[PDB]
Predict the structure.
Amino acid sequence: SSLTETYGLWSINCGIQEGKKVCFMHRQEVNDQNRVVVAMSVVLNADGVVSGNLTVPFGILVSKPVRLQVDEGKAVIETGIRTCVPAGCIVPIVFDKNYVAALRAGKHLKLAMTIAAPGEPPLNDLFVQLNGFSNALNRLIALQKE
Amino acid sequence: SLTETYGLWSINCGIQEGKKVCFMHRQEVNDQNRVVVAMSVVLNADGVVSGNLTVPFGILVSKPVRLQVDEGKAVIETGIRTCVPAGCIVPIVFDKNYVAALRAGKHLKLAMTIAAPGEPPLNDLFVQLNGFSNALNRLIALQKE
Amino acid sequence: SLTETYGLWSINCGIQEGKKVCFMHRQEVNDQNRVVVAMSVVLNADGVVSGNLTVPFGILVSKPVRLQVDEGKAVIETGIRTCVPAGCIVPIVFDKNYVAALRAGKHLKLAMTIAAPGEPPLNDLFVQLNGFSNALNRLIALQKE
Amino acid sequence: SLTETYGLWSINCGIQKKVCFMHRQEVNDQNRVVVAMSVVLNADGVVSGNLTVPFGILVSKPVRLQVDEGKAVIETGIRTCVPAGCIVPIVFDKNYVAALRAGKHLKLAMTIAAPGEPPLNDLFVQLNGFSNALNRLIALQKE
Amino acid sequence: SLTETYGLWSINCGIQEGKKVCFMHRQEVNDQNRVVVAMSVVLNADGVVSGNLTVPFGILVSKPVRLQVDEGKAVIETGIRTCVPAGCIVPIVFDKNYVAALRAGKHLKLAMTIAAPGEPPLNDLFVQLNGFSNALNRLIALQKEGH
Amino acid sequence: SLTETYGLWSINCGIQKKVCFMHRQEVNDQNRVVVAMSVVLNADGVVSGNLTVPFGILVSKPVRLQVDEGKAVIETGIRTCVPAGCIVPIVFDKNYVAALRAGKHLKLAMTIAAPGEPPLNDLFVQLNGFSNALNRLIALQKE
Amino acid sequence: SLTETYGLWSINCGIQEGKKVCFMHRQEVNDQNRVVVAMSVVLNADGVVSGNLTVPFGILVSKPVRLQVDEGKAVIETGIRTCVPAGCIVPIVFDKNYVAALRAGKHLKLAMTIAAPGEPPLNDLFVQLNGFSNALNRLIALQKE
Amino acid sequence: SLTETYGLWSINCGIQKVCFMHRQEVNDQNRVVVAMSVVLNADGVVSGNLTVPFGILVSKPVRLQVDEGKAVIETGIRTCVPAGCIVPIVFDKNYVAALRAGKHLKLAMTIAAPGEPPLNDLFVQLNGFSNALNRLIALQKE
Amino acid sequence: SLTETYGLWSINCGIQEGKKVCFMHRQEVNDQNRVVVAMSVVLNADGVVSGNLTVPFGILVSKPVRLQVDEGKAVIETGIRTCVPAGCIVPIVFDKNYVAALRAGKHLKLAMTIAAPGEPPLNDLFVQLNGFSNALNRLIALQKEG
Amino acid sequence: SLTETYGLWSINCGIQKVCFMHRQEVNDQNRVVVAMSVVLNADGVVSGNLTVPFGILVSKPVRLQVDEGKAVIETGIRTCVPAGCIVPIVFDKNYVAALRAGKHLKLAMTIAAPGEPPLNDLFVQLNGFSNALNRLIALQKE
Amino acid sequence: SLTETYGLWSINCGIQEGKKVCFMHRQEVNDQNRVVVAMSVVLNADGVVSGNLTVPFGILVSKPVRLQVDEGKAVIETGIRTCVPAGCIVPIVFDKNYVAALRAGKHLKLAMTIAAPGEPPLNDLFVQLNGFSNALNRLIALQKE
Amino acid sequence: SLTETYGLWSINCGIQEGKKVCFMHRQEVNDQNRVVVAMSVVLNADGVVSGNLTVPFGILVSKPVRLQVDEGKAVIETGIRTCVPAGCIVPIVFDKNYVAALRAGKHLKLAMTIAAPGEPPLNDLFVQLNGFSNALNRLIALQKE
């Protein structure tokens, strides 16, 4: 019986996949037409590392990296698309202790990528809102101890 | 009848049987976005806080529904009164001490028994309490109006 | 799993829970042709007739559901175990004497309490017993098969 | 055009030239929109926009805007009505903006076009997140 | 409540608060056959003709709605009272002289202001008056059947 | 673009430059358009436009237009067909326009593309209101 | 085969059992734009004006349907023959004098009895006669063709 | 308002409790062609309504006969509604007794068509009539 | 063409292309209320009862369909003639002795072979005979009328 | 009435027993732009109908050419129906022989539009024409 | 399971009894684009060609289905085994000589009897053989893989 | 923009940026008739054939897509550039030698890696080459026009 918890703008669900109880932390961003443009889903691993997946739009140049930055600060991750599914293109993400700390203090997780189009234009206006990240992560830590 | 929002809690006022009445409410949903548990609450003239908690179908009606604020000592044991198409209705009355625990709490944890072979417990349901205190303050303010 | 018809009563057999279990059932409808009350019954190996009665929503769960064959002295008092989307489930067990009354009866009258202000009775609900005896005879015959 | 959220307030940026707006809808228990408010920051620094009110409002009589029970009172009127409802243009000075940031509700008062001309006073816009959303509008101007 | 037809004008009667009330009405449509302007009118006990004009959405409510029978001197200036899903409602009262102009007229021309940047005029809207006189005569006759 | 009505004829104006046209549709007992006529007033006073006739008309044989029983008669043909039907361009001189004003019906005569090539002579356009509608088109040109 | 319009009246011609028959018709609607009353009329081979009036359901079939041109002495009394999904059918035959009254009239007034407790009259229904004379002239002209 | 079943006949009760006895007959396409609804009155008389098809000649009577016996009633259509044409029926003590012992209630009427043909193949099935009427008597005493 | 009801059996009379025929019929359904087996029967002028049994798809056509009234001596063996969208059609002819068994019986039991690997039997299908006798009496009565 | 397939061409037979030879051409949206239906007549003549789009200038001819060769027919629209505009076609022995050896039957027509532009990019594909026509000859002997 | 196309014939492969089984198939449609006849065929390990023919409903099951390649002396007589919602199933086994005729043929002609009064023949149904040889060559090639 | 057909291959022409562009395309479907793989190709100025291959979702983007004509030695290795709602797009460029192999080939075999635990291969996908040569000849002929 998988009840959704809400911490600011972030949601938490605990579910059974491949016979395992796993609790995940998630957020969707929508446009003015209320359709999902970017999504992020995150788990707390046993060693304390925060990892999961970022869902980005179709039409992104797969050979060029996806850049992740907390606001305009010094926390920069560069990763890439692993595969795309009907929901969009999947970008695996692993956050170290330092990046997690920046995520808790930040407001926006800014994304930067390249469009697969003539001229190869950048797409830099996408982000994930971080309001409630810290509290939702604290709950994920608390659910591990349970 | 405009909806007021205080954290996760909502307030609606309606004119029932001549007089005005204002209620405080919250719904919890699953990952499929369907309502699993609901809570609706009013303020009475004597000062007590009471209302109804809506729980799922398939709950063993003869065994009680246990309400606990987080992991504290505020424990209420009550039962299902009836079930309607929306689910099974659990009447709830909170004393001054329990109300104070609700204001300071994060989760109102629910414990009940499933009517199934083996009679398994259902303990993972809750009502989130973010905004309870501010919504209850508004209910107090609306009584004076 | 072909449906057999004995008067107003129906019989279906299935593999349920591994074993081939045959059940005896009847639904009652209103003028809008929606189900208000249902009854499903099995014959156990001991010769004891048991099963479930489905009653409407909004019934006071803490007070009992009374079962009476017509106006006779065959009176059973039982209660709601749980409620599901189809309605509220009342388990029923009939002894040899009650079974004999069901065979000779016309109506199985139901009496319950509505969960409403004042707690009014609901006494106009019944299960029609036309074909009960013959359907039970078939259930006995299917046990020997 | 990604939607930003600040408390109960939303921010969307579009094109008309780039223009970012700040908006909030209020619903009833039947979950339909009764009142809406949309707001922009102007190049000089004045906060303005539109309030959408229900149909059946007496158009000749003004719409009164008040932050809680304070001294910040604006009186304005319906400009026109469209299928979404009746449009009330609003301009907020520096002092009213400051009251909006500190306030909880923006209370609305208007007259119903009905026999007797009854008042409609129970409508409001919730101000939780107004200040943070306005700060973001200021920040988007500098960008 | 059977609909009577007099030229382009319609008549429907209904019982309002015990008394039989008959109204005179006309709607105008565009090329997509949707209603842009409507007019509904009753004959009052003292001989005055009053009712409502329905105009489109997007009209500047602070500026008046001007009513003119063709190009003559029968000019009324009034305003929008409210707007509903059907459009914006303009109450109208016609005196004996304006009623006489309506009977002899072909078009009731409307003039209003659009609530848009620049505040442009909307002057191409009208109510066609073919059958007005005969429908009003029927309205007079239906009053006498009352009393 | 409000529709004016003159008897059985309609007038609509629009931008293409304000162009006003005069039109009439004829329907059968099932209420489906069988024949249509649309007409404009040109700058030099000539009246021209299009007639819409049914499908299944022999395109190589002419469409004859006659006002009632008179002998001032126009011969023309189908230019093309569209989903709405087959389009017949029409130009009326001053004398034919005067006949249209005094007439009751504009009778149509054509040939069906079928074995035996049978005539279709029972189709018409009703002319009640033509004169008054054309007067309005003249008045709209001066405006 | 074109619909012709004469005031409020319509004319359609259609082939029935070999040769073409032309009929004269009118529907009356309410404010909800649904048909309450309809009239269809033909000229027979020897020049008799006859046809059918369609009236609402709920009319007392044993009591007559009275037809009157305005407030004149042209009065016909007839009855319902049958009812179909479209409503109740009243056959009508007009003599030379009644035809002449129809030509000069504005309304053909209908009077009937409602099949209801108390048996109330229904007198507010009519057929509008604007264009009747011109449409009848066209029926005469179509006979000669 | 629970439906009781007695053979082919149904019983439903309203509240004032006014109880009625009813039966519909359908064709092979499962559409209702004829219906009958009946109440028991305080003076022991059985009355109600018969619903017949559209297209029946209203000026000619509707004949009701229990099988091939002497119980013959002649009545007419009062009005027609969207459900069909309504024929009011009143049964005396002797006709009621015939209804209890009968199998079919045969209907005879005239079609409003050229030639005015008869319609004689319609009926109401009477299996369960007696038991349903007994229940109506029992519900009056309650 | 009004439907008559005799117990579980129905009677309809129809004009099927220049022929006025009254038939006696019964459908059996499962718990999902879909038709599994059907029987339609006419009375011949010489007293013989004949008609059609409709059985499911997937029945081995080369092996017979066995008909038995309860557990008595009345046994008919026949076969599928054809199949249509409604199912597989089995023609049936009942003699005077079988008709008498049908009147006194409760079930008409069916036995057939499934066209599947192993060729398994299907023996749980039946037609309920409640009202057969009364419906057949009505068919006799309708012959004297027509 | 089973459909036979010969390359890109189809054959259907039926009563009106007449057998016809047909082909449809579609665009990238998979909607029919042009169609051709053909019969073998009793006198040995190959004829039928070409269906072209709406908006074609009816007073100007439709030109038919097998590839870029000498076989040129000039005909016109007879009428238009909801399916499109109908062009009747009769083929002589020489044109039939060109159709058998050809790849495309090219179409040329005029659009009824300001300026009267040509429409020259429409065609009927001829793969299987000869085998389908052989079958039509064989069906005549049957 | 990607569809391969050889003329008018199609090839699909799937897993069945954990071996990979590949089948050769063709459907014929009418002018209404609905399937009237279908044929599905496998190459067996011993080099023999077998499978199923799907024929319409309403075929007399007691009388045989005759299969003939054009006008030659390749004639097989077989029958319906069963019918399913898709139609009536006719099992078919082709020997080396019949396979060779199938390769060189144009049409596989079917002859059967309709279950109707008079028992009329149905002789106008066929399976088109364009691409049979190449599709069978591919089936041989897929066996070696 | 009329569709030409050459065996299994299709040709469509458009006008992009005031220029005649004609493309050569083929879709492959499964037994459920949905598109699993697509190929679209243009003839460049230098006689080199280039375009796009559309592959399914769920393919490991970091690992290459291998293209091979039959069991021959013509092997291209390329990768996914992006994915769209229609699937994942693989740009392809064929040299004179590969074009010649495509002309003589039957299948263009595809090999790729699934983005799944274990990273399994997907090797059963192909594009059928029947009509490639004739469609390419037409593309050459359309360039000269």
In short: Chain B is about 15% helix and 50% strand. The helical segments of chain B are 96-104, 132-144.
